[PDB]
RNA sequence: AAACUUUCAGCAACGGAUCUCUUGGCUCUCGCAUCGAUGAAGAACGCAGCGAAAUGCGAUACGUAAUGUGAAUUG
RNA sequence: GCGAAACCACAGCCUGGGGGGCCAGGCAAAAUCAGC
RNA sequence: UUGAGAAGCUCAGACGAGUAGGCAGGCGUGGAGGUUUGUGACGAAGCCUUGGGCGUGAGCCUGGGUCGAACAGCCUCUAGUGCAGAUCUUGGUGGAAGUAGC
RNA sequence: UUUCAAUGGCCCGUCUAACACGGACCAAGGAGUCUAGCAUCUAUGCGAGUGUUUGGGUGAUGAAAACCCAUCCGCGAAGGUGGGAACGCCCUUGUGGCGUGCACCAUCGAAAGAGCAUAGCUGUUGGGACCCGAAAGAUGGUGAACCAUCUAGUAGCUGGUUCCUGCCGAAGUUUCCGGAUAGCAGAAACUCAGAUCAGUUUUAUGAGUAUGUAAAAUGAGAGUU
RNA sequence: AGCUAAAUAUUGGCGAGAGACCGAUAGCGAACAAGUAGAGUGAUCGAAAGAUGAAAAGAACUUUGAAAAGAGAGUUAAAUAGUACGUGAAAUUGCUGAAAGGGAAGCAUUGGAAAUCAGUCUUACCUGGGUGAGAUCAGUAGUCUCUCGAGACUAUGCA
């Protein structure tokens, strides 16, 4: 229920992702770093702060 | 071969588990379980419920508590009438094999439940299926 | 499969919860495959493709024909096995029970009271659309409908010269059981699609190929989710010879076996993280007087020039050697 | 790290200076008769992977901050934790009012907007 | 040096690409069966208030009668 | 006064050496017209 | 010490022409579904530029002028999808020249 | 950016050293596409099975969509001995011993189904078949040769065939009979860490300084289809 | 010797609904006057050509000129929309400005001279005391939504 929601939203399509050219950014309002990383995405990471 | 040819994201998970288990342990089991998940569908042939019951239970019938392990599909043989108390662990089970093991027998496992039962792969058998189609 | 919430709170038309619950249908434990749906939905979306072709009666000259004219017996439709179709709706309904595959799919359900959201049976007799906007605001689903209303834009290009002028989003999907006004009540709210529980479509459960469609379930159609898909070991009653698929991984979460007590007891001693950079420069032990002592623990006693002679060095030159020297 | 470029003159397709039909974007020549393909000395150079720039100081402006197209007021918000490695480049079709509100907020986040001065005459 | 030629830039010309449209085409689908010696299809000529690669019409001629709508036509 | 068209890689000095262009030389001033 | 997009991160060595050919990753164009609480009469697309920026490159982002209604990024699907050349097709315009010539 | 200085810089494509052939310039058009069949590889679904779409049922919200499916039908349908993957017990820690030995290969006996469907890639044939060009003939007419139509007549061939970067990268001679086999370059599977090799040099045996044969040096992981 | 519906075919005829089609060299030859203009004695062949503006408000009036037009003017938000009319690319032509040019330019590399452009550099930062403000403070009183307390508040003090 976590790697399920990262191999769906982290690699196929997530509505918050922004294809940058050296990075990718997450448009979520509960992101702590602004980037769409594994240890950063608020959807896959299911205990967050 | 370094990454599976498939896009089954329930099989990127297994490779993410057995390529961890390949490098943090000293077993060549995990360096053989991983060395098969990359192989294509024609390279992992099926193996029947009768050839499994014949492989373990022969000569002295040493079938005490070892889990047969095939990285393929455990199909059925219906010419086998009675099924012994077996225990298998494969990716796919056909719906007539999974109901012919449990009806009188033991456990049907994915390689997940194998890695929490024999993490270093002791007390197992690592069988294959016949690659031979005799012309194809 | 592994473990999920057993009972779902079934809501009311006013927004308050109700004491009665229902078991989680066995479909919601089916595989979530962002890959199989992309392969079926790709093939099911090309089945209502009306053909096209130039008239049948040199492609470099102007006024000339076009190179290899398009022809109406192009393969416009595509076959897909019924067990891969039946796999996709199984997987795309399970995605509709995950609260996080709905946000990433672009839904503003960040206020919805529960997932899967099951409103009561009385919602099947709602008659006027002001009794549907009523419902979608008590349970805070109307923020999705506003996402559809706020966001129609004129179609980019020549879709609009071709009878499609307005693109917009996809609001909730209301799955009913008996059509007693529920279709006609909701069918003039933007975004809202209404489908019977039996004839569920993939082009509405995963629009665009992206799973996680916001589904609002009706209690009378939530019950029929165990007779349409059945279970993993029990036949679906509304389908001959259907059994729900199972998984290649028994626990749906692979980074939480690695950290278990079954694995981390046996593993060998770990190495470090990203390693330190050793030997960044090639120091020279002839021209550096510190690396020389690191390599050779003899530089503290050499005495390269020992006086092994004195003034008293004797000549050692034989007569017969000097005779053969100065011969000729 | 000080930014550096392995080349500053772009590559310019062969004989795209003489003829006006031939455009200046680079196209590798396809004939073995060519002087250029065999790489005769004196002829122009070619795009190769040798001129690839540093994998850390890539995509960076000469200042050191990489670019980022902010096309509305909630696209500069993501740059809150990245104000010392990104410059908020505003997109071109953004109106001359929605532009003047990105500037007044990016300035609070300390983010460099590269072309904040467009359409905005100050008084 | 001026002129002339070449090059750059600005302006004026030429020219009609690009972009945007679209009462047109093309394709698929659905319903229907209806020309003529009671003079058909087609042709010629005419007819408009002012009409000129067009339309409608037949000397009752850019049409009458009958019904319906209801106060226009237009340069 | 009216007014084309063929044609048009870019072109236009000579000597020698491997041709208009290469190498080494002779040299080299605009702008044009009539014989040739 | 946080550097878990494990499709990420990190350390170290060797190597670098390339024809027929083989393999891989990407760039761009017209339409389709999904997405950006997307951009737009305070000026969208286009176009021009002795302006700036990025990428090895195909290309992209942008300032100024012009202009006047639509348009784009991301993930997929789709093809009538990329031009220097074919004594190439159509259109436009040159030198020969105010020469030949009436 | 314009220009100056120094140094370099034979015009592009097609051909087969130069050539020839194409090129006045600019714009827009413009060339391996669709379909059927076969085969390989990969992906997925099910699995001794597999395939809904000829049809039927259903579908009030594009009802040509989605969904369900009867009766046929198509394709398919258990021997020892040596190795050898792996895994136990070891005690010479290991080494080695010891037991069970999958696939595949030898050996002697006479063999426990792997397929079906869909999609993608490349290839191959068949259609207009990458574009363009190459006298023809027929049928029916017009006028005393011409006009449409089949025709999108005909290449062994002539020209052209449209984005970037990276990696590997030949032969250009045979051997038989334009087809082969081998070779060179490649992809997977599966062998062995050994004396398995080596456009190589030694020593020894012979052979009439050269000749070939075997087990030393030197390097390098080799081999199978 | 004979008849007969329905299931079936339908690039035509009278209508209809559509489309992952083309978007003025495309899609029918024909979006416009189109089998029209035009070519051939004839059978037959057979094109080019769409867009001012929201509204024509389509430029009154004065003047030069035989005319065509031109200039002052004037309408428009726009004449940088004037029927040679939406945007207006390239070739190509003329003028103006700056350069260069001794029987070849063209381009590449390194720099001079002229012109010109950008860079956040504008300012910001950080550190004590005093004065005032209050709130997440009160040895404080109340409301609501959630779950004892977590937020939103309304008072009152601002210790």
């Amino acid at each position: 229920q976590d790697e399920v929601i990262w191999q769906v939203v982290g690699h196929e399509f997530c509505s918050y992702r922004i294809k940058g050219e050296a990075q990718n950014f997450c448009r979520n309002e509960y992101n702590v770093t602004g980037l769409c990383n594994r240890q950063s995405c608020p959807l896959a990471n299911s205990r967050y702060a | 071969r370094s990454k599976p040819a498939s896009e089954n994201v329930y099989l990127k998970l297994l490779v993410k588990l057995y390529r961890f288990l390949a490098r943090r342990t000293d077993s060549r089991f995990n360096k053989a379980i991983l060395k098969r998940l990359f192989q294509s569908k024609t390279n992992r042939p099926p193996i029947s419920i009768s050839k499994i019951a014949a492989l373990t239970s022969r000569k002295s019938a040493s079938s005490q508590n070892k889990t047969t392990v095939v990285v393929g599909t455990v199909t059925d043989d219906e010419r086998m009438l009675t099924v012994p108390k077996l225990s298998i662990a494969a990716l796919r089970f056909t719906k007539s094999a999974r109901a012919r093991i449990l009806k009188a027998g033991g456990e049907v496992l994915t390689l997940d439940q194998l890695a929490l039962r024999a993490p270093t792969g002791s007390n197992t058998v690592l069988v294959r299926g016949k690659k031979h189609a005799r012309e194809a | 499969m592994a473990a999920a919430r057993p009972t779902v709170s079934i809501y009311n038309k006013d927004g308050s919860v109700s004491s009665e619950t229902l078991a989680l249908p066995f479909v919601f434990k089916a595989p979530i495959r962002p890959d199989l749906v992309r392969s079926v939905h790709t093939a099911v979306a090309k089945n209502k493709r009306q053909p096209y072709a130039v008239s049948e009666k040199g492609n470099m000259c102007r006024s000339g024909r076009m190179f290899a004219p398009t022809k109406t017996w192009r393969k416009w439709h595509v076959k897909v096995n019924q067990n891969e179709k039946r796999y996709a709706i199984a997987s795309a309904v399970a995605a509709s029970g995950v609260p996080s595959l709905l946000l990433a799919r672009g839904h503003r359900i960040e206020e919805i009271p529960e997932v899967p959201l099951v409103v009561d049976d009385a919602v099947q007799s709602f008659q006027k659309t002001k009794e549907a906007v009523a419902l979608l605001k008590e349970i805070k689903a109307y923020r999705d409908v506003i996402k559809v209303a706020n966001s129609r834009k004129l179609r980019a290009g020549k879709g609009k010269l071709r009878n499609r002028r307005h693109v917009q989003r996809r609001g909730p999907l209301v799955v009913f059981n008996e059509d007693t006004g529920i279709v006609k009540a909701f069918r003039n709210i933007p975004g809202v699609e209404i489908v019977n529980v039996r004839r569920l479509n993939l082009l509405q459960l995963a629009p665009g190929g992206h799973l996680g469609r916001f589904v609002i379930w009706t209690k009378s159609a939530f019950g029929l989710l165990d007779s349409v898909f059945g279970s993993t070991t029990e036949v679906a009653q509304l389908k001959k010879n259907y059994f729900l698929p199972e998984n290649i991984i028994s626990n749906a979460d692979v980074t939480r076996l690695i950290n278990s007590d079954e694995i981390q007891s046996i593993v060998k001693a770990a190495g470090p993280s990203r390693v330190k950079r050793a030997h960044v420069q090639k120091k020279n032990p002839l021209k550096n007087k510190a690396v020389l002592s690191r390599l050779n623990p003899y530089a503290k006693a050499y005495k390269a020039n020992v006086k092994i002679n004195s003034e008293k060095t004797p000549k050692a030159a034989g007569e017969k050697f000097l005779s053969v020297l100065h011969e000729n | 790290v000080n930014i550096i470029k392995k080349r500053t003159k772009p590559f310019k397709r062969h004989q795209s200076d003489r003829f006006k039909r031939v455009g200046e974007s680079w196209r590798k020549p396809r004939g073995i008769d060519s002087c250029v393909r065999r790489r005769f000395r004196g002829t122009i150079s070619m795009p190769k992977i040798g001129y690839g720039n540093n994998k850390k100081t890539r995509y960076c402006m000469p200042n050191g901050l990489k670019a980022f197209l902010v096309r509305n007021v909630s696209d500069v918000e993501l740059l809150l934790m990245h104000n010392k490695t990104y410059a908020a480049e505003i997109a071109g079709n953004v109106s001359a009012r929605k532009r003047v509100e990105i500037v007044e907020k990016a300035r609070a986040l300390g983010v460099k907007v590269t072309n904040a001065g467009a359409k905005v005459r100050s008084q």
Side-chain angles (χ1 to χ4, degrees):
Chain A
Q1 205 207 332
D2 267 7
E3 193 80 51
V4 186
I5 317 172
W6 174 253
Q7 301 284 314
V8 173
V9 316
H11 286 300
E12 315 290 359
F13 169 84
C14 175
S15 89
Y16 304 118
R17 204 191 340 270
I18 306 182
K19 183 162 123 184
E21 203 185 355
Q23 298 286 326
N24 284 37
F25 301 75
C26 204
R27 181 183 287 99
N28 214 19
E29 30 179 301
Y30 304 71
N31 219 276
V32 280
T33 178
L35 317 172
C36 209
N37 288 351
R38 174 65 165 99
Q39 60 187 355
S40 306
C41 216
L43 304 188
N45 275 132
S46 188
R47 177 191 49 190
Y48 212 59
Chain B
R1 289 287 179 278
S2 316
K3 170 134 184 227
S6 52
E7 51 275 10
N8 189 355
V9 302
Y10 284 98
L11 189 79
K12 319 291 105 172
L13 263 60
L14 286 182
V15 181
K16 206 167 296 204
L17 159 64
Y18 271 114
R19 91 199 310 185
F20 168 81
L21 267 168
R23 78 166 146 82
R24 295 289 305 259
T25 42
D26 209 27
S27 274
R28 283 179 276 174
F29 189 57
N30 301 313
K31 317 178 142 67
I33 289 294
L34 179 69
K35 221 201 284 191
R36 286 162 183 279
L37 301 178
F38 301 140
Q39 293 193 327
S40 73
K41 186 184 170 299
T42 75
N43 259 318
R44 319 182 299 250
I47 172 172
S48 314
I49 205 180
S50 69
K51 194 178 290 159
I52 293 188
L55 274 169
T56 80
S57 314
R58 209 190 177 121
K59 294 231 92 54
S60 297
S62 54
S63 284
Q64 321 305 126
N65 280 121
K66 306 181 280 285
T67 49
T68 309
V69 181
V70 49
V71 280
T73 308
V74 178
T75 61
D76 190 40
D77 201 342
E78 61 295 9
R79 314 181 290 250
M80 182 152 272
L81 295 323
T82 78
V83 202
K85 201 264 180 177
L86 277 188
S87 161
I88 322 194
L91 328 175
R92 264 109 185 178
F93 286 81
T94 88
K95 306 188 299 298
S96 48
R98 204 191 323 261
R100 269 180 76 85
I101 291 153
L102 299 171
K103 204 42 181 283
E107 300 107 349
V108 281
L109 320 196
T110 76
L111 314 179
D112 198 315
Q113 283 164 349
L114 205 154
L116 307 193
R117 185 185 304 271
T120 183
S122 187
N123 263 61
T124 57
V125 193
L126 186 55
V127 312
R128 318 185 191 199
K130 307 264 289 165
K131 185 43 181 93
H132 213 307
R134 279 276 156 111
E135 191 162 347
Chain C
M1 301 275 138
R5 164 171 61 151
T7 88
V8 287
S9 293
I10 290 205
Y11 279 63
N12 207 37
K13 74 204 205 179
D14 67 33
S16 90
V17 288
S18 161
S19 90
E20 188 58 67
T21 75
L22 214 53
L24 197 71
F26 276 121
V27 59
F28 285 148
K29 310 149 170 202
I32 291 296
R33 261 180 131 188
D35 323 286
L36 191 55
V37 180
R38 184 174 59 222
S39 43
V40 179
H41 179 272
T42 283
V44 80
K46 328 177 195 158
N47 285 23
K48 209 165 162 47
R49 263 164 90 203
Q50 187 141 11
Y52 63 88
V54 298
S55 83
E56 62 92 18
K57 50 163 216 167
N59 49 259
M60 41 165 268
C61 326
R62 102 156 283 275
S63 76
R65 194 181 331 91
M66 64 132 288
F67 165 42
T70 48
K71 292 266 185 171
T72 72
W73 53 94
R74 167 178 320 200
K75 196 177 57 55
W76 313 96
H77 297 66
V78 64
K79 268 175 163 180
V80 167
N81 307 339
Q82 205 190 30
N83 214 127
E84 309 190 306
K85 272 190 218 205
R86 283 203 193 113
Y87 202 124
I89 306 110
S91 298
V93 166
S96 87
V98 180
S100 171
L101 288 191
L102 282 36
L103 289 200
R105 197 242 166 259
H107 289 313
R108 288 334 181 300
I109 79 145
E110 302 166 353
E111 298 212 307
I112 210 71
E114 197 245 329
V115 171
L117 177 71
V118 280
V119 302
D120 211 341
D121 177 275
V123 188
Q124 300 197 155
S125 315
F126 281 164
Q127 278 284 111
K128 287 205 148 275
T129 304
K130 71 177 186 294
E131 298 165 15
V133 152
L135 173 77
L136 309 194
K137 277 169 89 37
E138 321 296 330
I139 60 161
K140 282 88 71 179
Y142 204 61
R143 314 171 51 231
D144 209 14
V145 158
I146 307 314
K147 171 200 89 142
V148 192
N150 289 9
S151 63
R152 64 150 50 181
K153 296 292 181 186
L154 197 70
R155 165 102 48 173
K158 312 173 302 235
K160 42 196 203 280
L161 296 150
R162 288 167 191 199
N163 301 350
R164 49 208 190 256
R165 299 201 33 115
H166 287 106
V167 202
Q168 40 169 352
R169 312 274 152 263
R170 305 293 282 261
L173 161 74
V174 187
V175 171
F176 70 98
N177 193 29
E178 291 96 40
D179 213 337
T180 320
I182 195 181
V183 163
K184 82 195 203 67
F186 286 77
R187 81 200 181 155
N188 213 59
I189 301 168
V192 170
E193 262 150 336
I194 326 188
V195 62
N196 215 327
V197 68
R198 323 195 181 91
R199 63 191 51 111
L200 277 174
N201 174 27
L202 191 67
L203 304 169
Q204 323 188 356
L205 266 297
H210 313 137
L211 318 86
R213 173 78 191 266
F214 186 27
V215 183
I216 283 199
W217 292 90
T218 296
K219 182 182 76 70
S220 281
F222 210 69
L224 268 296
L225 271 193
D226 284 342
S227 317
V228 176
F229 302 106
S231 97
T232 172
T233 48
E234 165 74 31
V235 47
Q237 174 45 210
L238 303 194
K239 279 152 186 51
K240 283 172 210 158
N241 310 321
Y242 198 52
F243 282 83
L244 201 69
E246 307 209 352
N247 227 339
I248 310 329
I249 219 175
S250 88
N251 187 29
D253 159 3
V254 83
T255 81
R256 279 75 170 196
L257 320 163
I258 289 167
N259 303 9
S260 57
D261 204 320
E262 281 94 317
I263 298 314
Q264 306 272 342
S265 314
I266 87 167
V267 290
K268 76 194 292 181
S273 60
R274 44 176 216 278
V275 200
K276 83 181 169 169
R277 313 185 51 237
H279 182 270
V280 316
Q281 280 192 358
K282 187 255 303 179
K283 298 286 184 80
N284 181 39
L286 311 183
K287 194 179 154 295
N288 186 282
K289 299 281 146 174
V291 202
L292 170 63
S293 188
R294 189 216 305 179
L295 293 196
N296 163 337
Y298 191 43
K300 297 344 160 285
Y302 194 38
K303 284 332 310 173
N305 297 300
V306 295
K307 275 272 211 293
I308 66 172
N309 270 325
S310 90
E311 184 70 26
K312 60 156 193 307
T313 50
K315 216 95 175 160
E319 169 57 49
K320 65 193 92 53
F321 163 70
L322 264 292
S323 179
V324 80
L325 196 93
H326 288 157
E327 188 265 349
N328 197 161
Chain D
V1 195
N2 303 338
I3 321 294
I4 35 173
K5 299 297 140 70
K6 288 207 187 151
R7 202 176 156 83
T8 304
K9 308 298 304 167
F11 301 86
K12 182 182 145 297
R13 183 205 199 291
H14 182 40
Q15 283 314 120
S16 72
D17 56 320
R18 186 180 289 176
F19 301 105
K20 287 146 171 90
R21 48 174 180 274
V22 181
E24 276 132 29
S25 64
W26 171 251
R27 313 257 169 227
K28 174 207 186 285
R30 296 302 193 174
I32 64 163
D33 194 297
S34 170
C35 292
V36 192
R37 193 228 270 279
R38 299 229 206 158
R39 220 187 315 165
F40 284 140
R41 204 211 61 240
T43 64
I44 44 159
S45 47
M46 283 156 195
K48 292 195 287 293
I49 198 65
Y51 309 84
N53 292 274
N54 199 340
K55 196 195 276 283
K56 314 165 170 198
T57 76
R58 255 176 80 184
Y59 304 121
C60 289
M61 310 215 168
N63 47 47
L65 319 96
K66 303 177 181 180
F68 192 76
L69 272 75
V70 317
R71 31 188 90 84
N72 58 336
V73 200
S74 61
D75 276 1
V76 75
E77 172 46 3
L78 319 97
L79 260 56
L80 155 54
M81 290 257 290
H82 289 269
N83 60 344
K84 278 180 196 66
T85 181
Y86 268 106
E89 191 65 324
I90 309 192
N93 52 350
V94 182
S95 91
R97 174 251 301 270
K98 174 154 299 166
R99 180 172 308 254
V100 318
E101 316 197 48
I102 281 155
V103 186
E104 81 166 60
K105 190 223 201 206
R107 194 171 40 221
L109 317 170
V111 186
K112 303 309 173 191
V113 176
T114 325
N115 50 359
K119 319 176 171 188
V120 85
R121 59 180 289 270
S122 279
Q123 102 179 16

